[PDB]
Amino acid sequence: GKSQSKLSQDQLQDLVRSTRFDKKELQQWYKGFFKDCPSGHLNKSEFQKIYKQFFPFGDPSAFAEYVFNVFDADKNGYIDFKEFICALSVTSRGELNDKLIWAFQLYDLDNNGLISYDEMLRIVDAIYKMVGSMVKLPEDEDTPEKRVNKIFNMMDKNKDGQLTLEEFCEGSKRDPTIVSALSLYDGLV
């Protein structure tokens, strides 16, 4: 982005009003579902059933056609509900500290409490995917890897060692850019 989105102001409230509802609630279910049935991938029909259980406000079939329009252009017919929650952070309601934490508890489905570097780059990538569905991807910041590496380089890690929530948040702290990314959307709601 550079100044603001580039779509119909109306559609803006829709996409948002589409992700409305609670979170800590979905998190409880997301962990109980992935724990009883660890799969990672999810089907459309199945997903529709989920949206029809927590907050069937508008048309669940419409929102579905969306997720696929972004997470499914021509890959058979399956998407990862994990990367979805992560991107959800963009469209939600809470503080800033909860976001970083929310993302952590998101990839913490290994009861390890320690994520790997590769996961870090994969996490930001997920958010970078949904970003192409809202704002127009610029043309001077490709390969966000170099950026993520800087963080690890900032704290000086094993370029591969694992990191913890607490520290993960510290790495982003020394980089407000990660803090302004979300701030660049709080004054037109």
UniProtKB/Swiss-Prot annotation:
UniProt binding sites for Ca(2+) 1: 72, 74, 76, 78, 83
Keywords of the record: Calcium, Lipoprotein, Membrane, Metal-binding, Myristate, Repeat, Sporulation
Lipid-acceptor residues (N-myristoyl glycine): 1
Membrane topology: Peripheral membrane protein
Sample GO molecular function, one term: 1-phosphatidylinositol 4-kinase activator activity
Binding site for Ca(2+) 2: 108, 110, 112, 119
Pfam family, one: EF-hand_7
Locations listed in the record: Membrane
Cellular component terms (Gene Ontology): cytoplasm; cytosol; intracellular membrane-bounded organelle; membrane; nucleus; plasma membrane; trans-Golgi network membrane
Span of domain EF-hand: 39-57, 59-94, 95-130, 143-178
SUPFAM superfamilies: EF-hand
Function: Negatively regulates sporulation perhaps by controlling Ca(2+)-dependent desensitization of git3.
Comment field (misc): Binds 3 calcium ions via the second, third and fourth EF-hand.
Similarity section: Belongs to the recoverin family.
UniProt-recorded name of the protein: Calcium-binding protein NCS-1
Species of the source: Schizosaccharomyces pombe (strain 972 / ATCC 24843)
Gene designation per UniProt: ncs1
